[PDB]
Amino acid sequence: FREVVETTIIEGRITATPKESPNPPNPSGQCPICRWNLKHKYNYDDVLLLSQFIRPHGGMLPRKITGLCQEEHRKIEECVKMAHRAGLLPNHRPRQLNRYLTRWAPGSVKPIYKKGPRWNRVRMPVGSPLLRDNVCYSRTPWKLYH
Amino acid sequence: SSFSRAPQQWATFARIWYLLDGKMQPPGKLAAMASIRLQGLHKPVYHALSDCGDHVVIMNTRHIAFSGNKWEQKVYSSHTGYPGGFRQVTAAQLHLRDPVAIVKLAIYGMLPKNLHRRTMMERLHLFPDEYIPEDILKNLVEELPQPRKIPKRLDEYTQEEIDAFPRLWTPPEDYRL
Amino acid sequence: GYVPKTSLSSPPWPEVVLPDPVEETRHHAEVVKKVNEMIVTGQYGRLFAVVHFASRQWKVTSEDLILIGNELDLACGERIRLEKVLLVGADNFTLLGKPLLGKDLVRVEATVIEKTESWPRIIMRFRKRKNFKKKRIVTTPQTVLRINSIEIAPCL
Amino acid sequence: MTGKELFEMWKIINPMGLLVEELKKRNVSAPESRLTRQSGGTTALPLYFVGLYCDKKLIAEGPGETVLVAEEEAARVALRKLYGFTENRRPWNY
Amino acid sequence: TYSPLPDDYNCNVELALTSDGRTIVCYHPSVDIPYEHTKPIPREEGPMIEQLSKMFFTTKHRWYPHGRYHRCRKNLNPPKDR
RNA sequence: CCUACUUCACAAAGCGCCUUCUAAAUGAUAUCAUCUCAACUUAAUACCCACACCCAAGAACAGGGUU
Ligand SMILES: [Zn+2]
């Protein structure tokens, strides 16, 4: 990566470029997810995968730089949102209720004062439906609404 | 076997204090374990009339963890019987009032809706912190495993755990971050 | 076909590796030989059999009582060998059949003590507004068996 | 005597002393009573299992509402085990 | 090294088939508590009902009495067994 | 609540008096921007609590006082 060193002087210094591991097990895949057999096999828990696509101040990287699938870019974008809120990315700050699997922004959701009748009940969203097609090792699928 | 009648009978129906750490746990998934041990449904000697419930000590119930936006959406509604006395309060506000009441209401809803329910609630001991009284610490027998596996964060991965995971993609040599 | 270790890479259950059938059939031969030595040298104490007498399974030791809901058409005092024993346990071993045990292995005896009737047992039907009210009183026959002995034999 | 325990028939006081004397007759050391399991120690309904070890191998262990009760009862379990009069003994052959 | 359950706490379970494959022999002697796993032996109506409630961890209701109709329905010579 | 006034007069009253406490910045997806169902940062006390006779206590019971 390159940095913008300044003090009045402003210069740009290419510093310490990484590289991807030499042997993708699925070469001639397209996305770096697709190349490494990870099309449905990651969640918000595993932050070693999420952290590689994140700006050091917590934001996402654009799809052109990462070269992701469109699908997997929305999935990682969502999982990174769901992992900032569970406090799994503490060092991606710019400078207390425990959550996990939060689809919406916590300061934006009106409380359910009238949960409906049994045939029209307002449910609470848990997790994201972008992560439907993950490998469920249970028989029941993910309940996305509690 | 080969006990006398009275100490065998004492041994079988004796009740056991369980500890249950509720840090980073969901309250309903604590409430299920707690409810089973409060009714005595984890004993093969169980019967409804035989009164064989246990004690459940749940600690760290300030440190519960709702899944999804249940902190901001889930509503606890009560009514003082007076007119205009209907009080709906979200899970966050009620957790700032009393850091026991979410786990307490969860368990209290799980238990069978009968008259044994409040004797069962007087067997459950909720504490919001690491601090448990000494008279209760001298009763505990087994600590139950937490039902949710707390996912570790990026600070808590060791170096070899980070190194074992591959870098997936080559960044461009000139990109700013 | 490598997947890096994520949450959902592997299944969450730990893999078990079942032992190979050569050393496992040899190991079974060792165990059956041990238990057969316990049956030969009389190491066991008292037994309990699960016996499929009549239509149901009775868990049974020696010196006890079973109340059966039909007349067996035997005289009081007659001894009986209960076939269809399907579990036999001691303190340190059990033996369970697929689904029944060998007749040469286990022998369960039982005498008939008494042949009673049940207490009178009401059968009432009633539908409202229809004048529908029947009443019957039924007593089923019953016999009591006293399990005398569970003898076990070294035939493994 | 079917369904009756030994010390429902042969009543004794002080089973611990009796167990001590019997273990002297087999030329075994005096047993250490040694608290194996417990629950509800600070309540009106405790449960104890006192064990009785001889050269750090237990011979019997019994429950009780107090520690003394459980120790006496473990002494009784050991005495049933020395005399063959256990709950699991071979039944009477008639 | 396979164990179908952690043979640690109740009995050491050792399953077997016979050569005919007709009976399953289970062998299961008891697991004694180790000596190392042991500790040495250590050496008015309102307030009375609250005191009993708090003592036996029950509610207050079973300490109030009951009337004669319920005291006389009770079977004082109930059937015993075993 | 009764000092006055008024109905009245060992007192009760009112017409009389007293008291009444979502919005910013920053900022990614989408290198600009962008309020962000993106992340980060920022904006209940009071009250109450131990015979008999008279009573400002009172339907009875209860309560207060009886030095
Ligand atoms: Zn792809």
DSSP letter string, C1-45: ------SSSS-SSPP--PPPHHHHHHHHHHHHHHHHHHHHTT---
Q: Rounded to 5 degrees, what are φ and ψ at A145?
A: -140, 115
Rounded distance between C-alpha atoms, residue E61 and residue A66, angstroms: 68
Q: Rounded to 5 degrees, what are φ and ψ at D71?
A: -70, -45
* 3-class state of residue C152 by DSSP: strand
Q: Position of tokens 């600590």?
A: B143
Resolution in A: 2.4
Question: Closest partner residue to C63 among D2, D86, D88, by Cβ?
Answer: D2
**β B17-21/B140-143 pair status:** parallel
DSSP letter string, chain B: ----HHHHHHHHH---EEEEE-TTB-HHHHHHHHHHHHHTTTSTT--STT----EEEEE-TTSBEEETTHHHH-EEEEE-SSTT-EEEEEHHHHHHH-TTHHHHHHHHHHS-SSTTHHHHHTTEEE-SSS---HHHHTTEEEEPPPSS-----TTTS-HHHHHHSPP-SPPPSS---
Q: Position of tokens 């030989």?
A: C33
State how many domains chain B has. Answer: 1
Rounded distance between C-alpha atoms, residue C79 and residue C112, angstroms: 7
Q: How far is the CA of A36 from the centre of ligand 1 (A)?
A: 9
Nearest alpha-carbon partner for A46 in A99, A92, A21, A83:
A83
Rounded distance between C-alpha atoms, residue B35 and residue A98, angstroms: 23
Within 13 Å, how many C-alpha atoms sit on residue B94's CB side?
A: 22
Q: Give me the CA B83–C1' F19 separation in Å, rounded.
A: 27
* 3-class state of residue E25 by DSSP: strand
Whether residue C1 lies within 8 A of chain E, CB to CB, comes out as no
Q: Judge: E58–B55 Cβ closer than 8 Å, yes or no.
A: no
State how many domains chain A has. Answer: 1
Range of the domain at B108: 1-177
Contact B147, B29 (CB under 8 A): yes
| Size of chain A in residues | 146
Q: Position of tokens 């009763």?
A: B139
Q: Which amino acid is at B12?
A: T
Strand partners, C93: E27
Question: Dihedral through CA C99, CA C101, CA C102, CA C105, nearest 10?
Answer: 170
* 3-class state of residue A130 by DSSP: helix
Nearest alpha-carbon partner for B56 in B139, B133, B112, B135:
B139
- Here the CATH number for the domain that contains residue B158 is 3.90.1180.10
Residues of chain B contacting residue A126, judged by C-beta atoms under 8 Å apart: 67-68, 70
Burial (Cβ within 10 Å: 0-12, 13-18, ≥19) of residue C48: middle
Experimental technique of record: cryo-EM
Range of the domain at A111: 1-146
Rounded distance between C-alpha atoms, residue C47 and residue C66, angstroms: 17
**Does A have 3 or more CB contacts under 8 Å with E?**
no
List subunits contacting chain C, requiring 3 or more Cβ pairs under 8 Å: A, B, D, E
Strand partners, C110: C80, C147
Q: Position of tokens 């249970």?
A: A138
